[PDB]
Design a protein around this ligand. Sequence first.
Ligand SMILES: Cc1cc2nc3c(=O)[nH]c(=O)nc-3n(C[C@H](O)[C@H](O)[C@H](O)COP(=O)(O)OP(=O)(O)OC[C@H]3O[C@@H](n4cnc5c(N)ncnc54)[C@H](O)[C@@H]3O)c2cc1C
Ligand SMILES: Cc1cc2nc3c(=O)[nH]c(=O)nc-3n(C[C@H](O)[C@H](O)[C@H](O)COP(=O)(O)OP(=O)(O)OC[C@H]3O[C@@H](n4cnc5c(N)ncnc54)[C@H](O)[C@@H]3O)c2cc1C
Ligand SMILES: Cc1cc2nc3c(=O)[nH]c(=O)nc-3n(C[C@H](O)[C@H](O)[C@H](O)COP(=O)(O)OP(=O)(O)OC[C@H]3O[C@@H](n4cnc5c(N)ncnc54)[C@H](O)[C@@H]3O)c2cc1C
Ligand SMILES: Cc1cc2nc3c(=O)[nH]c(=O)nc-3n(C[C@H](O)[C@H](O)[C@H](O)COP(=O)(O)OP(=O)(O)OC[C@H]3O[C@@H](n4cnc5c(N)ncnc54)[C@H](O)[C@@H]3O)c2cc1C
Lengths: 324, 322
Amino acid sequence: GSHMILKRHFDEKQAQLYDVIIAGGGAGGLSAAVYLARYNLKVLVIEKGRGRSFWMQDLWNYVPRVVSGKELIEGGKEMALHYGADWLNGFVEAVTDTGEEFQVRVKYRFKNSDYPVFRAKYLIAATGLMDVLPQLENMQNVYEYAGYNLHVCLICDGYEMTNRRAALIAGSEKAINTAFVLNWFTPYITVLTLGAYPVGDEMRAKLADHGYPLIEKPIARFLGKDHVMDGIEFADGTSIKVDTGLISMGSIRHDGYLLDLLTDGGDIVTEYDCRTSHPRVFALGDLKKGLNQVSIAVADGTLAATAIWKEIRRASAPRKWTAP
Amino acid sequence: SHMILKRHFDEKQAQLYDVIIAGGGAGGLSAAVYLARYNLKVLVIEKGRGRSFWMQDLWNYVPRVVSGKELIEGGKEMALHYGADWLNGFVEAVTDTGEEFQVRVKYRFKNSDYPVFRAKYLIAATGLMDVLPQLENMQNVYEYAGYNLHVCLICDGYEMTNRRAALIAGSEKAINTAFVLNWFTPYITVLTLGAYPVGDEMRAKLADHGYPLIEKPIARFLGKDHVMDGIEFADGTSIKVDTGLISMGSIRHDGYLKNLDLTDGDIVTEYDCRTSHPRVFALGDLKKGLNQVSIAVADGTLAATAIWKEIRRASAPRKWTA
Ligand SMILES: Cc1cc2nc3c(=O)[nH]c(=O)nc-3n(C[C@H](O)[C@H](O)[C@H](O)COP(=O)(O)OP(=O)(O)OC[C@H]3O[C@@H](n4cnc5c(N)ncnc54)[C@H](O)[C@@H]3O)c2cc1C
Ligand SMILES: Cc1cc2nc3c(=O)[nH]c(=O)nc-3n(C[C@H](O)[C@H](O)[C@H](O)COP(=O)(O)OP(=O)(O)OC[C@H]3O[C@@H](n4cnc5c(N)ncnc54)[C@H](O)[C@@H]3O)c2cc1C
Ligand SMILES: Cc1cc2nc3c(=O)[nH]c(=O)nc-3n(C[C@H](O)[C@H](O)[C@H](O)COP(=O)(O)OP(=O)(O)OC[C@H]3O[C@@H](n4cnc5c(N)ncnc54)[C@H](O)[C@@H]3O)c2cc1C
Ligand SMILES: Cc1cc2nc3c(=O)[nH]c(=O)nc-3n(C[C@H](O)[C@H](O)[C@H](O)COP(=O)(O)OP(=O)(O)OC[C@H]3O[C@@H](n4cnc5c(N)ncnc54)[C@H](O)[C@@H]3O)c2cc1C
């Protein structure tokens, strides 16, 4: 269908068996939905909202136009519907494999939620992940600057950080090593560990050799005006002046609904097809091993949708021109 | 972030770029913005009137449906904004000196200058061009090629769904896409243009499927306002079709790569898009894999990052000395 699913259609759609069900309606999931809808296959996209792409203010490196994250989802959503994809505003809880097909439970609505289950021969895991954010009592203070000039991905915003006073909020001793990659863009790095883990002397000597100050105080407030951060204030009232920052605190994986198996080294392993260890499920974008960009996520959906279309097509009966 | 004119040839020819990108299409432009955004020196060289330029509607590239011209125009602007250099020229030849590449470019169509630029890395992103049916009045083919007379099944299969379709095959082997196109529409008419003999094996297979086989040459494509509605053959007869698919092969834009060596139909690459020849990457339509804009853009991201990682890891750490 070419319409969003509301309360009435659950009885119909639960009986109906989709060719593929897409979990997550972001960059990769929408691309896959558009391709699958364009291949005349039954596809349902399930999007919870407020995803990682939604908080992206400026998509800098996705040709041909610079768009916001909300514009990206809105345009791709519109496109998927236009081509015949079904879209549902819900959260995917779990999946059951019966040998053939998948059974996908979805929490509909935040409170007093319906738990409709949908059927599909294939599944596409395209739920991405969410970046960890420093924790303050007023998170609106963190939100005012996060995603603007307080960055979460080095490749996405490194260009705008060039030769600027930068603060690296590292969530672990390993995460401090991003200073030695961030320094490519700016050597004016201040490493902030938030008083969370003790730093080894090896790394302490390395930061000193490079001249990067190490501040192990907790954070209290981000200082800025009109979404442009200009400083960081610590618990004791003191502060530092920074023109930009990079959060390197790890990522949260939206892989609850995923089954077991599925080999990984922190992220699911996939073939050039984006086919995971399970033959019938494909992993897209940030969930799979590889770059975490919109370009590669969009391409992943193209790869997965085509591999699925080839398998179904090669198993379908030829459509002949029968007598009229 | 400037476009090269007459003055800048001598200066930029002396400069060693970090990478040169051959072809300013989907994949090349994506690689350009990433490299420029890695604060690396990159030069893009675009001839113009490429395959993507003739694409009228980009259907399956989120978030917006744009024309191929809009795609190149936007990506070009972006690359320039971020510091990439753009040259309007044709890449003629490439030499690997062991420590760098020298790329000669024909500048201007007539009375042309032949500046040769330098770079440590090279990205081959010149794609290919689809073969078209040959009529005396080629404007009649261009009138409909790219609108509803298609060249790529994956791109426009959706618009061909359950419509009277003509498959213009350039060879008996090419006729086999009818058995893939039938997924979208079974109302397929196979046209051989009377250029090659069809075997009875294939002749019987088309009959079993009910796909008419017409072995007459073509004379004119019938339509009005870029929407084809039929085909007229040499003998005066005609058929009515609402759409068609051209399957006559492709010519590669890989002339300048003759000197280099590049395992091959298409160039083979790793996941990085790295070719066999060290320090050169092949993107998009030149490499083995799907021929789509989405995967071409992603190819540029992979190559640009792989180059950045190699240089970054080879550069001295930038320490804070104040
Ligand atoms: C501030 C910021 C700026 C960025 N800038 C750039 C940039 O310039 N260039 C770039 O390439 N990348 C950028 N990124 C990262 C980029 O957004 C991701 O790499 C990209 O979106 C990955 O796409 P995806 O489809 O894998 O995941 P997403 O785009 O996050 O899509 C996942 C979607 O699935 C939904 N979802 C998740 N779990 C579930 C569930 N269980 N049920 C239902 N729905 C679910 C989410 O709501 C989300 O919308 C940026 C990120 C941030 C935070
Ligand atoms: C750069 C950046 C900027 C950000 N800015 C903001 C901001 O300004 N404001 C903000 O609030 N957050 C922001 N975030 C995200 C923030 O950090 C938290 O991740 C978010 O606020 C918490 O989401 P949630 O409570 O919906 O958790 P979720 O994991 O989305 O929800 C938890 C549970 O709720 C249920 N559920 C979720 N969605 C649905 C649905 N559609 N239907 C039914 N059930 C559902 C599921 O069962 C799930 O287990 C930002 C993140 C980044 C990286
Ligand atoms: C009518 C039509 C419709 C299409 N629709 C779709 C679609 O809906 N979706 C989709 O995914 N794909 C579509 N395609 C295919 C799509 O255009 C390609 O897959 C995509 O553009 C690949 O880009 P590329 O960078 O590999 O090559 P391109 O971007 O096509 O071209 C590379 C560039 O290099 C330049 N170049 C070549 N040789 C030289 C040289 N010697 N010197 C200088 N410059 C050179 C060319 O001029 C060109 O601009 C369509 C193609 C056509 C013809
Ligand atoms: C769907 C579709 C629709 C098409 N529609 C059209 C159409 O409407 N009109 C049309 O003309 N073609 C169209 N084409 C392509 C067409 O078939 C021919 O490829 C093209 O028209 C002529 O190419 P060319 O002879 O210039 O070859 P090219 O290789 O482009 O040119 C050959 C020579 O010109 C020189 N040269 C080219 N560009 C430059 C430059 N910027 N600077 C210096 N020297 C240069 C080079 O030195 C080269 O040796 C279409 C193709 C497809 C697939």
